[PDB]
């Protein structure tokens, strides 16, 4: 439950540097620094497409289901921090 999904990566990376063969496919190329990354509403919610499309590579693997539906919670704590920061800037109550 403690840290956002690109940490969770980067550590099952990190212990493969050190189970991991078994969720290679899942964590081989995860999109949600891409997420991170884009400044744009639309763009965030094509990234999200993005980041299920990766998660669907689950089945090929042992993962058990609530260490990814931790990692489901991570990548949606990190989808709110992203939309308050891109609507903080359009100033709603302005226009």
Known sequence: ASGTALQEISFWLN???ATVNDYNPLMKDFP???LLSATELDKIR???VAIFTHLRK????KYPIQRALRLVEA???DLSSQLLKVLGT???MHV
Not at 58 to 61: F, K, Q, S, Y
């Open 90 to 92: 359009r100033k709603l």
């Open 46 to 48: 094509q990234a999200l």
């Open 15 to 17: 212990l493969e540097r």
């Open 58 to 61: 689950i089945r090929n693997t």
């Open 32 to 34: 949600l620094n891409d």
């Open 75 to 77: 990548i949606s704590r």
